[PDB]
Amino acid sequence: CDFPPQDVVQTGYRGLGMQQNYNPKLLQKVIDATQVPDAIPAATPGGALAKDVYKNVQVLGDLSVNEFNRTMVALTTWVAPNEGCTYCHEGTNWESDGVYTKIASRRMLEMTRDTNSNWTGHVADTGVTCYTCHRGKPVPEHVWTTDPGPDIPSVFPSNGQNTIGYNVAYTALPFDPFTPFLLGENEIRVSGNTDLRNTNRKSIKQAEWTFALMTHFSEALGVNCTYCHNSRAFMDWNQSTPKRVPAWHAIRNVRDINIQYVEPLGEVLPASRKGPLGDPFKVNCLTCHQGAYKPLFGVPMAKDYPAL
Amino acid sequence: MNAKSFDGMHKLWMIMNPVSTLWAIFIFQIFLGLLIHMVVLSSDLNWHDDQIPVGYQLQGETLPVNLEMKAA
Amino acid sequence: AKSFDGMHKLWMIMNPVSTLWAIFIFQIFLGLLIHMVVLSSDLNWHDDQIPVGYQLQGETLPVNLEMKAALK
Amino acid sequence: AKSFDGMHKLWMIMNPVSTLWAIFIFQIFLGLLIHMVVLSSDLNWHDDQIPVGYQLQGETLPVNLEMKAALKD
Amino acid sequence: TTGLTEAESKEFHGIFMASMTLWFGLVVLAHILSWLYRPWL
Amino acid sequence: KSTTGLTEAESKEFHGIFMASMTLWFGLVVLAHILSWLYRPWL
């Protein structure tokens, strides 16, 4: 039970539905978990470059040395604050690659720069840092792997549904829509462009897989269908909200993160960071929103750091 | 006793109806037969699809006539 | 020790036929239930591939292997 | 010490056969329920793989291993 | 009323109490064995 | 008063055979469990 009163935000014409509903007691749990990190004082300008002073820099070579050290202080406070600087080095041999965390970290720096520069159709001028997903822990909280399903007899193949389904909002819908959509690249659209029978050959099962993915979009942001659609025509772009256009880019963005960066790391990481089928943990909508309409309610952290 | 303990057993059918019992036994046995066959067919002991003594779909796919037709 | 002397009088207040039918039906239901509960655990004996896996045995018969080679 | 003397008169107002049937049925239902409640906890004794795991024992028999090897080719 | 006299009630009560005591004895024994095998508190 | 029509002699007879049958059934159950313990011990 969620006892009244509630908070309602209108987001459309009057008498059409189209509004978002909040319970003040549940929203307090999301407010009580954000915790924007504290600023790091800007670095003294000018000096020698990192490429001319350090021995093994392959990404951040065009920062001054002050900017470099500042970036490293930030990487410690964002990812691994408990274990300290030796989480990704040996003792004080900074230039060694003897740990896998340094390879992982280098690849992650590249991925964050790519998202911050090339995907502004989705993260527009707020960008991301490490803290957007690690939130001060080495392993992020909300990730996914390819779901094998419940245990069934050995001669029975999986259909991929009719269970509880914890990632698709507790429905009996297909329980793993991320493999075909957020790592593979399948068509999400199912409806026709004319009113009578034409060349469209999609089925009700494909419609169910789409419905599953949309359920996850709703849960990961704290909203309903009507945050981006008018239900009377889920396929018309002239009857959608403006928020449908960033989500369209978000999809593509997530595929990039998983195809170019995170899945190829399956060689470097240990067996601890993999699932039943032997693939690493991957990124969702929930990996950075974590139940809010913008990660951390949209505080712009990434502008203060020229390394990202 | 231990030997005369089951003497009056034949009197059972003076309190249990023979017709109801017969029908119940027959129906229960048929239901149980279907159930056990279905449970064993859904395991590793399955005997229709195990491809022993030979696989027949595979045998049909590799007949020379079918191979020559697929080659074009 | 003589506390259970009049126990045989139980059948002067409880119907023997009803009791018999209830016992039989309950025993059959419990038999089915316990077999299903133990088969769905680590003690499962139909699918455990002991003493051998039969589907795997059928996939590696020389005839089936030679047919799968000529297809591929 | 003398408070519970007339207790045997209980069966002059409560029917003995109805009470017996109620008790028996309730006891069977409770037996099933407690067994199911304990099986769904950390105390479960069918799936705990003690004293040994039998599915794991079947997956690593030499015959099954040798058959799974000759399929990777 | 149940139609039982007071003698019949006394008889029933005797056997009922004996049976209940025996049942509870068996329950206690089962729990002692379970505690020896898998202690839960 | 609730009654089944059985006299005391009929009740004695029924009780004799009922107890014999129940004892035999429990004997068979014990035998099944000894075999199962020998094959696949569960505790």
Place this chain on the structure above:
Amino acid sequence: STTGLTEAESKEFHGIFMASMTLWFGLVVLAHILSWLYRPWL
């Protein structure tokens, strides 16, 4: 009397009812003392 019990029968029933209820509440108190010793909740 709307239940058919006389006043003597009511007195008898009341005696045994009160004794039984007292014994039941005693057992409840004992269970709670044991639980407090094992796992205090306040």
Place this chain on the structure above:
Amino acid sequence: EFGYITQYFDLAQVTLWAFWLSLLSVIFFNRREDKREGYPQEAVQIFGKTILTEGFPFMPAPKTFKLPHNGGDVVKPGPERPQYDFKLEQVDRFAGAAYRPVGNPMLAGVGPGAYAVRANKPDLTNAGDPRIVPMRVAKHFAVVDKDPDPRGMTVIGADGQVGGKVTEIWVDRAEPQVRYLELEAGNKKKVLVPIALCVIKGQKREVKVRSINGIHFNDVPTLSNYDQITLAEEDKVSAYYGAGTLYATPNRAESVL
């Protein structure tokens, strides 16, 4: 192109028209079956003349029910039996005005106390026996204990007074259930009351009949033979109890607020 159109006429459209025409046509047939009772209706004209009109659509052609056990044929729409002799005075001089009873309202047969003129034969079972009978003629019935046996109770009558005492129960053999209670009244006549107008209190051992008053139980219509009841008599009895819902107290027909 999202909303391109190829052709305006399709099958869904035609099928919808066909449905509009298939409805619109069962309405016609049902409305015609509705007029096998009570028609032709009586239209009052400009200065009082009455004519028979028939409505839209017109009345159907007569059909016949063949009743069992040589119970005759019933043609519908067919003739009617003649009304009895109700007296009424109109209140306002126009065709749509209401009427007032002329004499004693309880004994007038107008308003909620009107009844129909049915056959003077009892309703029958599938074997040919009378259907509603007292429990001494039907010797196989018994009241289930767990239920208050009304035989013996009194019949308080809506103003607190006593009407009489219950002496018999009248049952229905085709569907086993209670239909009437028979009671002896204040002047020692035997009268019936329908079971659907009685509130039975087992502990008070009373039957409350909210419809009529206590003294009104002396004038309930009586039966010819007390081993059966006919359709006409059922109507008379029930209608007398229904007249009291508006005529028992002079304040009952008088605008709550």
Place this chain on the structure above:
Amino acid sequence: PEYQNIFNKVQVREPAYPGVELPKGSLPRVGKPIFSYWLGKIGDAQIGPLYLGGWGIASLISGFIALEVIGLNMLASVGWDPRLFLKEFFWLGLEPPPPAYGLSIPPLAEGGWWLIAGLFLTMSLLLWWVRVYKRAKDLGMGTHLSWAFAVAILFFLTLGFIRPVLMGSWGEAPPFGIFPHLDWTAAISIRYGNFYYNPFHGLSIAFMYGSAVLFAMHGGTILAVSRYGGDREIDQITDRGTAAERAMLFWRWCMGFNASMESIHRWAWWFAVFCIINSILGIILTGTVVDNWYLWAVKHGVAPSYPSELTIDNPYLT
């Protein structure tokens, strides 16, 4: 207040009624009738006896084979555990074949069991149809209950056999679950553009609302004149009494027209059958003739048009 006639205050028993005599050559009725006090508080107390002949045994063999199949597959989907079966019961189901198999017969654990259960359930319902027809006709009554049953069977076969065949896939049919079949309902509305703009769907909703209205009205009216013997409808039909007269005056005065004691039952019949006729017509055209019900409604001048104020850019056009 006054007695409302909702519960039976006094009950009476006579020996059980075996039933109207059947034509010579019939089988006896099976069972000894028992009485229920709680069922007698609201209705008739007798349970049984029952008539089992040729068609009602073939039915009941088919139906139970189907039920065994459905139950066992739901149970195999949790690994045979009955505890998990009870725990997750509303989420389990037997699923149709993958749509790529078309109309062929697929292997048993990838849709063949669904096909078996569907076939056996079909045969069960057709044998039951024949039973219902013959039972009413052997007692000499009109066969009106068989016509309505035929309509219902036709709707079951339309969604399930006829539409999947006309589409070319068994994977277009519902599964056997509770939450699974609700998911099917929502998905087929989402795929074919909003069932609210299907006109046969609107008409069947009209007739389902109307069924509830009409049966509240009729149940009320007959309980309100049961003090004048109105619950005995056969006699009020073949010899109109005061109960029928009051019942028809009430509606005439209230809304201007009325039915008779026999005609209201024809209104009931039709209101229950048009609901399902429109159900069949609406499902049979979806997918096979119309691909988007909202675009159809726009082409035929039916859908409203909310004001816009903005412009959203379709990113597939950019």
